[PDB]
Design a protein around this ligand. Sequence first.
Ligand SMILES: [Mg+2]
Ligand SMILES: [Mg+2]
Ligand SMILES: [Mg+2]
Ligand SMILES: [Mg+2]
Ligand SMILES: [Mg+2]
Ligand SMILES: [Mg+2]
Ligand SMILES: [Mg+2]
Ligand SMILES: [Mg+2]
Ligand SMILES: [Mg+2]
Ligand SMILES: [Mg+2]
Ligand SMILES: [Mg+2]
Ligand SMILES: [Mg+2]
Ligand SMILES: [Mg+2]
Ligand SMILES: [Mg+2]
Ligand SMILES: [Mg+2]
Ligand SMILES: [Mg+2]
Ligand SMILES: [Mg+2]
Ligand SMILES: [Mg+2]
Ligand SMILES: [Mg+2]
Ligand SMILES: [Mg+2]
Ligand SMILES: [Mg+2]
Ligand SMILES: [Mg+2]
Ligand SMILES: [Mg+2]
Ligand SMILES: [Mg+2]
Ligand SMILES: [Mg+2]
Ligand SMILES: [Mg+2]
Ligand SMILES: [Mg+2]
Ligand SMILES: [Mg+2]
Ligand SMILES: [Mg+2]
Ligand SMILES: [Mg+2]
Ligand SMILES: [Mg+2]
Ligand SMILES: [Mg+2]
Ligand SMILES: [Mg+2]
Ligand SMILES: [Mg+2]
Ligand SMILES: [Mg+2]
Ligand SMILES: [Mg+2]
Lengths: 155, 73, 119
Amino acid sequence: ARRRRAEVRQLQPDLVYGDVLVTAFINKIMRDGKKNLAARIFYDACKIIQEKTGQEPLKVFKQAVENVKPRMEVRSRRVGGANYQVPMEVSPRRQQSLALRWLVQAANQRPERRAAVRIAHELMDAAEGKGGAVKKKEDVERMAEANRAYAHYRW
Amino acid sequence: PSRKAKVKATLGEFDLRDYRNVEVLKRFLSETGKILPRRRTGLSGKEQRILAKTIKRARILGLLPFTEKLVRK
Amino acid sequence: KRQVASGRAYIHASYNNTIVTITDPDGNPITWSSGGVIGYKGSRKGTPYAAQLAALDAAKKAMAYGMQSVDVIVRGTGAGREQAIRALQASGLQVKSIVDDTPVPHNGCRPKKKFRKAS
RNA sequence: AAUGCGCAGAUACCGGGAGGAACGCCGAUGGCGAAGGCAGCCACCUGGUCCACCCGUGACGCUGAGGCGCGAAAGCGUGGGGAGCAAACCGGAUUAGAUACCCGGGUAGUCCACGCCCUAAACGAUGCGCGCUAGGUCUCUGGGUCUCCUGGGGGCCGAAGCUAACGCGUUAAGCGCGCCGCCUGGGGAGUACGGCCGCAAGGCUGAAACUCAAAGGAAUUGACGGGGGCCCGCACAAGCGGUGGAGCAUGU
Ligand SMILES: [Mg+2]
Ligand SMILES: [Mg+2]
Ligand SMILES: [Mg+2]
Ligand SMILES: [Mg+2]
Ligand SMILES: [Mg+2]
Ligand SMILES: [Mg+2]
Ligand SMILES: [Mg+2]
Ligand SMILES: [Mg+2]
Ligand SMILES: [Mg+2]
Ligand SMILES: [Mg+2]
Ligand SMILES: [Mg+2]
Ligand SMILES: [Mg+2]
Ligand SMILES: [Mg+2]
Ligand SMILES: [Mg+2]
Ligand SMILES: [Mg+2]
Ligand SMILES: [Mg+2]
Ligand SMILES: [Mg+2]
Ligand SMILES: [Mg+2]
Ligand SMILES: [Mg+2]
Ligand SMILES: [Mg+2]
Ligand SMILES: [Mg+2]
Ligand SMILES: [Mg+2]
Ligand SMILES: [Mg+2]
Ligand SMILES: [Mg+2]
Ligand SMILES: [Mg+2]
Ligand SMILES: [Mg+2]
Ligand SMILES: [Mg+2]
Ligand SMILES: [Mg+2]
Ligand SMILES: [Mg+2]
Ligand SMILES: [Mg+2]
Ligand SMILES: [Mg+2]
Ligand SMILES: [Mg+2]
Ligand SMILES: [Mg+2]
Ligand SMILES: [Mg+2]
Ligand SMILES: [Mg+2]
Ligand SMILES: [Mg+2]
């Protein structure tokens, strides 16, 4: 990105909830370009959301996502000395992606024998503010800011 | 442009060696105590030379400050 | 335990640390602080953040003697000279004034070589 | 970062005191001086200078080997002084080492008086005097009929012209005359010797053997810089998957 600024790709909306914050999540669940696997994982995960709580999955999903995105992170920088962890804002498009990513990674940490169940339980636990994923969010934000001392590089 | 308020205009037919005159003399000092530059006194090279020699004298009498303290920083 | 209500806060800016004395209206100290007092080891202390809590500490410590408002005197040209002042404003203390007052000689003593530059 | 200082209470803050040193702003595009150099304020003593009047003397002028005086800093002698700063030195760091740069200390010294020393990138790297040869513009300081004219001084641009070029160009490096000083390829060498001077440190004068084919000045085109400015590249950053471990295949 020396030259232009690069636009975010506008991904085709969902087939079941019509939401683009979903195919977003579905792409991140995907691997080796097998999209059908990914959908079958996620929509299944939605069916397990519906079982273990009366709530519509789409409001459960969005709830955990909002609950995961950080308001601060650190980014190494230097002039001399050593790499100074500089605290700074997390510009909305990135909160979006950091949340989606961590969610999936966290999901695949779980002991749950199959995916979907992993995704469901991770999607659920995160709505309740618990469950590692929010670990990252909090342990990011907490670890950032704790370098307040070096926040004088606003940008 | 850089043409705000000057000093030489502000006053009138004043003696430039009257180190005892203060209400006049104190118009040539900084917000602090510093002697004002020609760009702000609007005095000729020679006029300004005489201003110092008196503002200094006036300082020794204790009529003019040597220095001050910047308010509202 | 004195109830001074009003007083003065001297901020002392410096490139290495920032320190803040709070004082009864005759200049006698009530409490103080700095970046070391706040917690910071060498080198952070000078940072603007240090000065923020430094000033806040000092003011919190002075609210104890029931200060309501102070006059600010700042000396030094350090980093976080302003952050100390901002912090005293947002401190709840009423800042009645601010005055720069960094001392300078009318050409007096020979500076240390680190401050000599050239001619 | 440490050394260092600090509970024998430091740092920050207020009041009182002692001292040594240097004078902020005004302040430079400034001024003065033969040069070195000269800046708080007052007084005394004292040197140079510029202008107006066109009053006096009547070629009394210029230059100047020797001589004599002056001469930043450092350095020396005898007393005095000693705040800050600081060779040497003593420590802390850094580093491959670090007899350095950075950090905490610190003696001579830096200040005064008197007496020496006499050097320098003591530089405009441009000896002094006089006459001549377009202008423009900025500035310091006189005088006059005061839109401007006329002197002295400091800058910039430029006529002619000069210069190897860069540049200089009424403040010549132009055109000329007078006088002094100095140069004659590089190294050996500002050495040796001799003299003279100095308390010293050293200074002034100043070679040769031997040795080289160069040493130099200015400019040109490049390349380069841990110089600038502008800008690119999956160059980093942001990402997603790898290699580096395993077994095997293939190349070395
Ligand atoms: Mg100790
Ligand atoms: Mg004790
Ligand atoms: Mg002290
Ligand atoms: Mg005191
Ligand atoms: Mg003393
Ligand atoms: Mg000058
Ligand atoms: Mg001169
Ligand atoms: Mg000079
Ligand atoms: Mg005289
Ligand atoms: Mg006559
Ligand atoms: Mg006659
Ligand atoms: Mg001398
Ligand atoms: Mg000396
Ligand atoms: Mg001596
Ligand atoms: Mg002594
Ligand atoms: Mg020292
Ligand atoms: Mg030292
Ligand atoms: Mg001695
Ligand atoms: Mg002497
Ligand atoms: Mg006039
Ligand atoms: Mg002239
Ligand atoms: Mg020509
Ligand atoms: Mg030419
Ligand atoms: Mg010229
Ligand atoms: Mg001539
Ligand atoms: Mg020539
Ligand atoms: Mg010679
Ligand atoms: Mg030779
Ligand atoms: Mg020879
Ligand atoms: Mg010599
Ligand atoms: Mg000899
Ligand atoms: Mg002898
Ligand atoms: Mg050359
Ligand atoms: Mg280049
Ligand atoms: Mg990368
Ligand atoms: Mg392998």
